[PDB]
Structure formats: structure tokens, C-alpha cells
DNA sequence: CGCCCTGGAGAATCCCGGTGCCGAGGCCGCTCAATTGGTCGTAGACAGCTCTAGCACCGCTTAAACGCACGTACGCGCTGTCCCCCGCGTTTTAACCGCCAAGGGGATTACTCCCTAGTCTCCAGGCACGTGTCAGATATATACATCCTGTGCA
């Protein structure tokens, strides 16, 4: 989430997003919630609830 | 046989939109030195008076400025040479980010004493000034010292 290319790709003009990945990690919910953030920005910052 | 003038080509530039991005300025919260007045004592302008070097000048007395004539030699124009850095393509490194997060010491702000010096005061003495005296530079007697002249001679 703290990387620069994170916010670099967020402001582009698109009506849809498609993520192609092999597999994410099981634990470390921060990166899972991060991919969920970059999917669409409807998610709050609370992953610990 | 080889050079100015023309034409084709190429690319570097100018200028006009076109959309994302961020700090200039506005707005507010706040807050502290400017403002107003009074007090107080103090140097600056106004004469006052004085005194002293600048001013304008006159006339010897050399001394640089100048006009010119000659001249010769280096600044300059021209020419041949050659070599060194620019233009460009290919190689090689510096720096940014991603990972993966922690502290660290030094200027800042606030508080806190404490003691060196401003201010006032009086006592003393020391260097700017007047005068004594020798050093150096100056102008003049002087005892010979070198031509000139009577002058006597062989």
C-alpha cells in the first residue's frame, strides 16, 4: 500500500479493473486488504475488526 | 575541367489547445509591539567672536612641450599546414524504487539563578605643548698657488 506505483495507477480513467495473479498470501491480511483496496475504493481501513 | 545558384529534402521550432496538479491567497484565531500621552533633561541651532590660511597677484628663472625630420621594424595581411575537438554511435555506471522497519541526538522552548558591568563618584597623572640643544647644511677668511709683468742680464 505504501508504494508509489500504488497511488500512481489509482487516478487513471477506467470503468473497470481486472487483476491477474497467481495467488496471494494466506496470513498478513494487510496485503489482502490492499488488493481489495486497489480493486475498488469502497473499503474502509479496518482489517482488524 | 571544376565553382555560385537553385531546388529538393529533412528536421527543429512556434504556437495553439487539452487535462491533471498544487501552493497563493483568503479566511480565521489569536496576540503583542505600536500608539498615545506624560515627564524630563539635554544636545543642536543661533549667534558671537576671532583668526588664519586660501585668494588673487607680480615678476625672475629656468624647463618641459612642441614642431619636425628621419627611419626602421613590428602590426598586419596573406598563405599553406596539420591536428584536435565536435558530431555520433555504441558501452558502461549512478541513482531511483521495493523489501522490511526501527530509533537518535541536537537545536528549540521554557524555566531558573547569579554576578559583571552600567552608572555614579572622586582622585590623580600624562601626553600635547613649549623650550634647550646639537646635527647638518651654508657662507665666508685664508695661505698658498698659477699667469702676468717689470726687469735686469751675457
UniProtKB/Swiss-Prot annotation:
This is Helicase SWR1. The chain holds residues 832 to 880 of 1514 of the full protein. Present with 656 molecules/cell in log phase SD medium. Catalytic component of the SWR1 complex which mediates the ATP-dependent exchange of histone H2A for the H2A variant HZT1 leading to transcriptional regulation of selected genes by chromatin remodeling. It is found in: Nucleus. Component of the SWR1 chromatin-remodeling complex composed of at least ACT1, ARP4, RVB1, RVB2, ARP6, YAF9, VPS71, VPS72, SWC3, SWC4, SWC5, SWC7 and SWR1, and perhaps BDF1. The lineage of its organism: Eukaryota, Fungi, Dikarya, Ascomycota, Saccharomycotina. Disulfide bonds: none annotated. Belongs to the SNF2/RAD54 helicase family. SWR1 subfamily.
Amino acid at each position: 500500500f505504501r508504494s508509489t506505483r500504488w497511488q500512481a495507477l489509482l487516478n487513471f480513467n477506467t470503468q473497470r479493473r481486472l487483476l491477474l495473479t497467481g495467488t496471494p498470501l494466506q496470513n498478513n491480511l494487510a496485503e489482502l486488504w490492499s488488493l481489495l483496496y486497489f480493486l475498488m475504493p469502497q473499503t474502509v481501513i479496518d482489517g482488524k475488526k
